[PDB]
Amino acid sequence: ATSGYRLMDKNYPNSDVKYKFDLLKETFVDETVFQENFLTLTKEILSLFNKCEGKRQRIVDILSIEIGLLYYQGKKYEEAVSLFLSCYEYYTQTNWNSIGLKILQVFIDSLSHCPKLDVLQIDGESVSASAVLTNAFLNILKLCKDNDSKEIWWKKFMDLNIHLMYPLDGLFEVTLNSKVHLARANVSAIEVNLKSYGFPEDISTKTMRLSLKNMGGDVIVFGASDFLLKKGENKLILECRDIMYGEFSLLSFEIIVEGITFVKEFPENQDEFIVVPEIYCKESTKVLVKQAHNLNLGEYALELKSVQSDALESLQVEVEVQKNNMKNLPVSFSMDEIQARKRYNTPFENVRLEYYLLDQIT
Amino acid sequence: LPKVSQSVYQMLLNEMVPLAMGIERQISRLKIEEHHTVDIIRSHNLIHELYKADEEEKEKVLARLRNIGFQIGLKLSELLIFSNNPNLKFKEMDLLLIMKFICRDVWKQIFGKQIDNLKTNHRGTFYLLDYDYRPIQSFSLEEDAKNEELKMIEPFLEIPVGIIRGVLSSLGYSSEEVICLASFIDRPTDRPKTAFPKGVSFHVQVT
Amino acid sequence: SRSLKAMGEEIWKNKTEKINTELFTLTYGSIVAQLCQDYERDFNKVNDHLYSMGYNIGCRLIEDFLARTALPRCENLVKTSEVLSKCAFKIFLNITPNITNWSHNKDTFSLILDENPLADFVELPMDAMKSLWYSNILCGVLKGSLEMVQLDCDVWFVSDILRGDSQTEIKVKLNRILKDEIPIGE
Amino acid sequence: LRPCFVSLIDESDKPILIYVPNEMNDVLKYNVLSNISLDYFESALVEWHSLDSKPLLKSIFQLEGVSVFAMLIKQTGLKIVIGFEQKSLSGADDEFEAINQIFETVRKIYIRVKCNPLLVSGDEKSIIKSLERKFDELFI
Numbered sequence A: 001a002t003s004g005y006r007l008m009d010k011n012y013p014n015s016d017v018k019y020k021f022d023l024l025k026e027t028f029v030d031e032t033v034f035q036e037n038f039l040t041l042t043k044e045i046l047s048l049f050n051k052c053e054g055k056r057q058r059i060v061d062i063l064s065i066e067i068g069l070l071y072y073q074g075k076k077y078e079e080a081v082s083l084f085l086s087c088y089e090y091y092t093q094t095n096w097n098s099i100g101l102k103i104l105q106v107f108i109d110s111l112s113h114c115p116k117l118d119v120l121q122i123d124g125e126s127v128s129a130s131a132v133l134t135n136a137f138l139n140i141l142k143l144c145k146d147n148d149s150k151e152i153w154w155k156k157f158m159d160l161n162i163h164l165m166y167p168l169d170g171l172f173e174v175t176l177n178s179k180v181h182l183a184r185a186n187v188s189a190i191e192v193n194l195k196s197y198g199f200p201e202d203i204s205t206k207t208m209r210l211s212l213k214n215m216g217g218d219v220i221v222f223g224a225s226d227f228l229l230k231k232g233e234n235k236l237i238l239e240c241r242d243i244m245y246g247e248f249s250l251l252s253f254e255i256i257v258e259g260i261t262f263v264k265e266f267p268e269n270q271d272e273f274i275v276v277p278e279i280y281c282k283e284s285t286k287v288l289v290k291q292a293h294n295l296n297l298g299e300y301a302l303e304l305k306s307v308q309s310d311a312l313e314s315l316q317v318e319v320e321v322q323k324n325n326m327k328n329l330p331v332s333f334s335m336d337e338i339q340a341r342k343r344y345n346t347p348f349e350n351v352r353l354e355y356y357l358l359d360q361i362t
Numbered sequence B: 001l002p003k004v005s006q007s008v009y010q011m012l013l014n015e016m017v018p019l020a021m022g023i024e025r026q027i028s029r030l031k032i033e034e035h036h037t038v039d040i041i042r043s044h045n046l047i048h049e050l051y052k053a054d055e056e057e058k059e060k061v062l063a064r065l066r067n068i069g070f071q072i073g074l075k076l077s078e079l080l081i082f083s084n085n086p087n088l089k090f091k092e093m094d095l096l097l098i099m100k101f102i103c104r105d106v107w108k109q110i111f112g113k114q115i116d117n118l119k120t121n122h123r124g125t126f127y128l129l130d131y132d133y134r135p136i137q138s139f140s141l142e143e144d145a146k147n148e149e150l151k152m153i154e155p156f157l158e159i160p161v162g163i164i165r166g167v168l169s170s171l172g173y174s175s176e177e178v179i180c181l182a183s184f185i186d187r188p189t190d191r192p193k194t195a196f197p198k199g200v201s202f203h204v205q206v207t
Numbered sequence C: 001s002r003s004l005k006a007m008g009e010e011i012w013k014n015k016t017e018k019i020n021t022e023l024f025t026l027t028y029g030s031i032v033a034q035l036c037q038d039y040e041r042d043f044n045k046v047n048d049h050l051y052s053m054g055y056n057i058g059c060r061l062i063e064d065f066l067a068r069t070a071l072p073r074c075e076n077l078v079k080t081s082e083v084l085s086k087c088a089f090k091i092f093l094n095i096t097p098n099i100t101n102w103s104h105n106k107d108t109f110s111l112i113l114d115e116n117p118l119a120d121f122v123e124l125p126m127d128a129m130k131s132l133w134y135s136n137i138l139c140g141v142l143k144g145s146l147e148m149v150q151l152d153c154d155v156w157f158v159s160d161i162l163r164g165d166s167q168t169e170i171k172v173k174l175n176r177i178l179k180d181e182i183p184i185g186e
Numbered sequence D: 001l002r003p004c005f006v007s008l009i010d011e012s013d014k015p016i017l018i019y020v021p022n023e024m025n026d027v028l029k030y031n032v033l034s035n036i037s038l039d040y041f042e043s044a045l046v047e048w049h050s051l052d053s054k055p056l057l058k059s060i061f062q063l064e065g066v067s068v069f070a071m072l073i074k075q076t077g078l079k080i081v082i083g084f085e086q087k088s089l090s091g092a093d094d095e096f097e098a099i100n101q102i103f104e105t106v107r108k109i110y111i112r113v114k115c116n117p118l119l120v121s122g123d124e125k126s127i128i129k130s131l132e133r134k135f136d137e138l139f140i
């Protein structure tokens, strides 16, 4: 009231009435000693509170961050950054958004100011300074809900490496629009939409993959490479080259930006499985397998046909049987040994594959 | 304070099992409302359908109706706590106080009679015993068909199960460590014989 | 014997059991909530299903209403309006809807619900702001009950305070007064 | 009496809503005050009511020139905290009763919004929007 030296940001209701707080003009005669006087008082309070078991812990954290902000005001950031490592991210799960914004903003600024800041350790293995800085940055992106004024942090970091996952949710959300349909010769396409309400600017992605898992366990990936995400609602088609048919359950969606990978792992057992049917196109290379047409008595065989064979650089087609009794292989591609696989390598128009029935299977 | 006629409320409460089957049959008589023909099937037919539908259909309908009762209890409990203000605490002092509150208040404000004496193991499960169970006091089939009668009532007994489950929720315990089951094992011990012959018991367990 | 208003007040005063309105609101709201939940918020058909509810419950409720009041059969909209305005709502829901919008040749009219005890506190989402009615059970009850007094009526909602309109209105137009049956034998 | 901030916290220390009835960084100060007040409940320093089964208001502390009161809902675990300017209080018993009435109105609004039969199960955004518009309607 008598001087006006601001402490961080805390201000009182400006009352016209003044107070002659003059008799104690010894501990704040200058501007410098005031900061460490306040620090000493706060440290004494912190020590007394910390000796109260663990029944009063929130005020301890508030006082600690107050000490950190005073260190930041004093421009001795080396202690401040270390002090903030404890509650590095603590005030973001418990919905204290302004507290998290303030603390994590000052943390990022302090880390960005000092020259070296090569290595730091939080509770164990020494984590890279850039690795934690980018985590804090990406956290403030989703935490700060201000529409257009978040571009300051973006411009701060673009001008500023480890393959690093993150929980994509909170930045992007994706829903399945329509379902699979043929688009070109031998590629099944599916159109999806993703709303980018987290970042302010357009994103130059590198690879986008949607995984569909079968009930058996194997998976198929619908890909899309080098797609420029616009700021807002945008739709795009994901193409899969190597497909399987049948029921399929959605597994996960992945954005691969240059350096970081955002992953969103779906829940399990939704009973919203999508089906990948066969779509017939005249211009589509395929291979057909079926029992032979002309054959002798007791001389089984298969016929492999290559529709739309024409020119092809190369292809490896392999055919293998499955056992039924769960321990019998009721067919063999050899009279002497017991084989369960054929491996063709060269192009063909029509070929005759042998067969040797084992016991009785129809 | 304002009030509504009890008869219309009771009829609305009873007409949930017909909802519980009509809705499920719509997921899985004809007349024109104003321009489009809507289909209505009589309420008494749907209860008979629920008697004879399926083992897996019945479980789905009972779960749906339990969810309805859970919503009743969940919304109702906060209002009763604000109004009557019992001497409970949030999570657990003892289950006896919670059940005493339920018996003395919830059944007063839903039904017209206090629920009767309740058993107490003092460790695990509690039994809530009600005689003549108001919302089915006028339910019957025939002079001879008595087993069919009882087996045709059981879906109606999910409203109070859901209500109790909801009231336990928002009062500490969630719907994972609480299991409640209604049954007709109760006897008309010495009370005057009403229309319905058999009482109702709610075997409710917590941990 | 007595005026309809006097009859309704007298029967409501000391000839009926009573239950709290707030419990009724909770019950109906839970019903509509479950309907909303498991139809995937397809609000076009929840209206029809609530209409089916209203028809079913009112087709029984008419018996209780007539057993209590023991009124004669209604014959024209003029007296029917008086009845369901100044007794029938008073016995059950304890409200007195107003009559306005008398169409030409006394064919149709509208019930203005000054207070709707079915929606004592409700706030629909933006999805239902202009899709749901939330009070279809009332007009369903009206259609079901009036079907049983031997007169077919077309009843629907014109407006609702929940959707943001000035007042809640229920037009109760009549289609035809169907006649009684007779048992011939050939 | 215009409150400075209104905070609602459940049993799990999850702040539902810390609405401020709108300078810019006062929300930070109010959030810090709410956090400090949160731990004040489970403390032997203050004796809660525990008498006649009635919610009891209490003057919990004064930091940053903001008289802040709080109430505890014993049966549900809900916690309401309300702040006021020092210059707007005369320290009269009728003012205490008025503040208690404001607390009761806030509790009624919270109950009415929570028992709305269109809340899906736990959609917090709808609760925040409804409570925010109701508080806008009241404190104005």
Ligand SMILES: *C(=O)CCCCCCCCCCCCCCC
Binding pocket: B008, C058, C061, C062, C065, C071, C072, C073, C074, C080, C083, C084, C088, C089, C092, C093, C137, C138, C141, C142, C145, C146, C149
């Ligand atoms: C001549 O006899 C006409 C009689 C009047 C029609 C009967 C009206 C009964 C239904 C009134 C509405 C009750 C409330 C329904 C919502 C639960």
